[PDB]
Amino acid sequence: KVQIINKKLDLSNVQSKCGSKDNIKHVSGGGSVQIVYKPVDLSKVTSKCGSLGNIH
Amino acid sequence: KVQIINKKLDLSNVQSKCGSKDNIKHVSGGGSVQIVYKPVDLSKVTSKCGSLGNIH
Amino acid sequence: KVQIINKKLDLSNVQSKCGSKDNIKHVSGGGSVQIVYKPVDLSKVTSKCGSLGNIH
Amino acid sequence: KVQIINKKLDLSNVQSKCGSKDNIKHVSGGGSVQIVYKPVDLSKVTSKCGSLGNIH
């Protein structure tokens, strides 16, 4: 059989019979507590501009 | 058989017989508590502009 | 058999016989508590403009 | 058999015999409590403008 794979950026997960226990028990803060659990961030924040002119 | 795959950006998950226990038990804050659990963020925030002119 | 796949951005999930227990038991805040659970965010916030002119 | 797939942005879920228990038991806030559970956000907020002129 012929096979071709062409990936630019690979984070593919493949598992079989895999266990995973993750605990976060006791977190205290005097101020502001922030907990971010398994985030995935593909967000873009862009500002394109073509031909900007600032004459004085 | 012939097969071709062409992916630019791969985070494909494939699992079989996989267990996963995730706990967040006790979180306290004096101020503001924020908990974000498994976020996925593909959000865009853009500002395109073509030919901006600022004459004075 | 012939097969061709062409994906730009892949987060496809494929599971079989997979268990997942997720708990968030005790969260307290003096101020404002915010809990965001498995969000998916494809939101866009854009501001296009072509040929902006600011003459003075 | 011939097959062709062409996807720009894939988050397709495929499961079989999969269990998932999700709990949020005890959340307290002095102020404002906000809980957002499995949101999906494809919302757009745009402001297009062509040929903006500001002469003085």
Nearest CA in chain B to D2: B2
Structure determination method? cryo-EM
Cα–Cα distance measured from residue B17 to residue B30, given in angstroms and rounded to the nearest whole number: 41
Nearest-neighbour CA in chain C from B40: distance (Å): 5
- Residues of B within 8 A of D10 (CB-CB) are 12
Residues C42, D41: contact at Cβ < 8 Å?
yes
Q: Tokens standing for A1?
A: 């059989």
Best of C6, C7, C10 to disrupt the A interface by mutation (most A CBs within 10 Å)? C10
CA dist D46 and D49 (Å) reads 10
DSSP state of C18: -
**A56 pairs with which residues across the strands?**
none
- Structural tokens at position A18: 């895999």
Name every chain B residue with its beta carbon within 8 A of the beta carbon of A19. 18-20
A43 Cβ neighbours under 8 A, 6+ residues apart: B41, B42, B43, B44, B45, C41
Q: Where are the beta strands (DSSP E) in A1-56?
A: 2-10, 13-14, 19-29, 33-37, 40-41, 44-45, 49-55
State the nearest Cα–Cα gap between B40 and chain D, in angstroms: 10
Residues in contact with C33: Cβ distance below 8 Å, sequence separation at least 6, in sequence order: B29, B32, B33, B34, C27, D27, D28, D29, D31, D32, D33, D34
Asked if the Cβ–Cβ distance from C41 to D44 is below 8 Å, we say: no
Resolution of the experimental structure, in angstroms: 3.1
Rounded Cα distance, D36 and C37, in Å = 6
Neighbours of D29 (CB within 10 A): 19
Triad C17, A37, B15: Cα angle to 5°: 20
**Which residues of C, range 11-50, sit inside 8 Å of A by Cβ?**
11, 29, 31, 41
Rounded Cα–Cα distance for residues D56 and D53 (Å): 10
Instruction: Write the CB contacts of A40 (distance below 8 Å, at least 6 apart in sequence).
Output: B11, B38, B39, B40, B41, C11
Q: Are strands B44-45 and A44-45 parallel, antiparallel or unpaired?
A: parallel
Q: Which helix (H) or strand (E) holds A11?
A: none
CA dihedral B49→B42→C14→D36, nearest 10 degrees, is -150
In the DSSP assignment, the letter for residue B31 is S
Tokens describing residue D5: 């797939």
Are C1 and D3 in contact, with CB atoms under 8 Å apart?
A: yes
DSSP string for chain D? -EEEEEEEEE--EE-SS-EEEEEEEEEEESS-EEEEES-EE--EE---EEEEEEE-
Both structure tokens of D4: 């062709």
Helix (H) or strand (E) holding B10: strand B2-10
Q: Which amino acid is at A15?
A: Q
Q: How far is CA B15 from CA B40, C20, C21, D14, in A?
A: 19, 12, 16, 11
From C3, C7, C12, B9, select the one nearest A3 (Cα to Cα).
C3
Are B50 and C46 within 8 A, CB to CB? Answer: no
Verify whether the Cβ–Cβ distance C39 to D36 is below 8 Å. yes
List of chain B residues whose C-beta atoms are within 8 Å of the C-beta of residue D7? none
- How far apart, in whole angstroms, are the C-alpha atoms of residue D11 and residue C7? 11
Q: Which of B23, B30, B39 sits opposite A31 (nearest CB)?
A: B30
